[PDB]
Design a protein around this motif. Structure first.
Motif, PDB file in Angstrom:
ATOM      1  N   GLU A  62       0.831  -1.193   0.000  1.00 14.12           N
ATOM      2  CA  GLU A  62       0.000   0.000   0.000  1.00 14.12           C
ATOM      3  C   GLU A  62       0.869   1.248   0.000  1.00 14.12           C
ATOM      4  O   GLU A  62       1.988   1.248   0.515  1.00 14.12           O
ATOM      5  CB  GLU A  62      -0.927   0.006   1.213  1.00 14.12           C
ATOM      6  CG  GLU A  62      -2.158  -0.856   1.049  1.00 14.12           C
ATOM      7  CD  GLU A  62      -3.145  -0.682   2.183  1.00 14.12           C
ATOM      8  OE1 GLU A  62      -3.010   0.299   2.943  1.00 14.12           O
ATOM      9  OE2 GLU A  62      -4.057  -1.524   2.315  1.00 14.12           O
ATOM     10  N   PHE A  63       0.353   2.314  -0.604  1.00 13.47           N
ATOM     11  CA  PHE A  63       1.112   3.549  -0.716  1.00 13.47           C
ATOM     12  C   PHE A  63       1.450   4.089   0.665  1.00 13.47           C
ATOM     13  O   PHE A  63       0.565   4.519   1.408  1.00 13.47           O
ATOM     14  CB  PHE A  63       0.333   4.583  -1.525  1.00 13.47           C
ATOM     15  CG  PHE A  63       0.183   4.224  -2.969  1.00 13.47           C
ATOM     16  CD1 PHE A  63       1.284   4.168  -3.797  1.00 13.47           C
ATOM     17  CD2 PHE A  63      -1.059   3.940  -3.498  1.00 13.47           C
ATOM     18  CE1 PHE A  63       1.150   3.839  -5.123  1.00 13.47           C
ATOM     19  CE2 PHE A  63      -1.197   3.610  -4.825  1.00 13.47           C
ATOM     20  CZ  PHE A  63      -0.092   3.561  -5.638  1.00 13.47           C
ATOM     21  N   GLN A  64       2.732   4.060   1.015  1.00 12.64           N
ATOM     22  CA  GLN A  64       3.180   4.493   2.326  1.00 12.64           C
ATOM     23  C   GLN A  64       4.570   5.086   2.194  1.00 12.64           C
ATOM     24  O   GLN A  64       5.311   4.780   1.259  1.00 12.64           O
ATOM     25  CB  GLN A  64       3.184   3.333   3.324  1.00 12.64           C
ATOM     26  CG  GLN A  64       4.256   2.299   3.049  1.00 12.64           C
ATOM     27  CD  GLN A  64       3.913   0.938   3.600  1.00 12.64           C
ATOM     28  OE1 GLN A  64       4.537   0.468   4.546  1.00 12.64           O
ATOM     29  NE2 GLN A  64       2.923   0.293   3.009  1.00 12.64           N
ATOM     30  N   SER A  65       4.917   5.947   3.142  1.00 10.54           N
ATOM     31  CA  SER A  65       6.245   6.535   3.155  1.00 10.54           C
ATOM     32  C   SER A  65       7.285   5.494   3.538  1.00 10.54           C
ATOM     33  O   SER A  65       7.044   4.621   4.373  1.00 10.54           O
ATOM     34  CB  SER A  65       6.300   7.709   4.126  1.00 10.54           C
ATOM     35  OG  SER A  65       7.589   8.288   4.140  1.00 10.54           O
ATOM     36  N   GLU A  66       8.452   5.587   2.913  1.00 10.55           N
ATOM     37  CA  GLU A  66       9.543   4.675   3.214  1.00 10.55           C
ATOM     38  C   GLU A  66      10.406   5.147   4.373  1.00 10.55           C
ATOM     39  O   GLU A  66      11.309   4.417   4.790  1.00 10.55           O
ATOM     40  CB  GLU A  66      10.416   4.469   1.976  1.00 10.55           C
ATOM     41  CG  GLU A  66       9.645   3.963   0.776  1.00 10.55           C
ATOM     42  CD  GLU A  66      10.545   3.384  -0.293  1.00 10.55           C
ATOM     43  OE1 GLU A  66      11.781   3.442  -0.130  1.00 10.55           O
ATOM     44  OE2 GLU A  66      10.015   2.868  -1.298  1.00 10.55           O
ATOM     45  N   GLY A  67      10.153   6.337   4.900  1.00  4.70           N
ATOM     46  CA  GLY A  67      10.878   6.819   6.054  1.00  4.70           C
ATOM     47  C   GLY A  67      12.263   7.315   5.709  1.00  4.70           C
ATOM     48  O   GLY A  67      12.689   7.348   4.556  1.00  4.70           O
TER      49      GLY A  67
END
Lengths: 48, 48
Positions: free
Chosen positions: B19-24
Motif C-alpha cells: 500500500e502507498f506508504q512513506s519509506e521513512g
C-alpha cells in the motif's frame, strides 16, 4: 531484570558546537588596505 | 455445454503491491547525526 534501568549510563560527546556566530573578516579588501605597516600612525596624503 | 464454467481456472500474480506508504528516513542527513551512541541520554556540549 527490569531493575537494570537503575544503572543506565549517559554519554557526553567530544565534538563541541559553537553558537552561531560570525567568523569575521567580512570586510577584508573592501577598502584601500596597506599591509605590513610599522609605527603608531600611518599617514595618507590627500590633495584637493 | 455451459457446465464448463465449473472447471474454470484462476490466475494468481506473484508481484505483490504494498500500500502507498512513506519509506521513512526522509530527514536522514538533514540534522547533525551521531552514530553508534551509548547510554540513555546523550549530551551535546555548546560554547558561546
Amino acid at each position: 531484570s527490569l531493575a537494570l534501568s537503575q544503572i543506565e549510563i549517559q554519554q557526553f560527546l567530544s565534538e563541541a558546537h559553537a553558537e552561531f556566530q560570525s567568523e569575521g573578516f567580512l570586510l577584508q579588501g573592501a577598502v584601500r588596505t596597506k599591509s605590513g605597516t610599522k609605527g603608531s600612525i600611518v599617514h595618507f596624503p590627500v590633495f584637493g
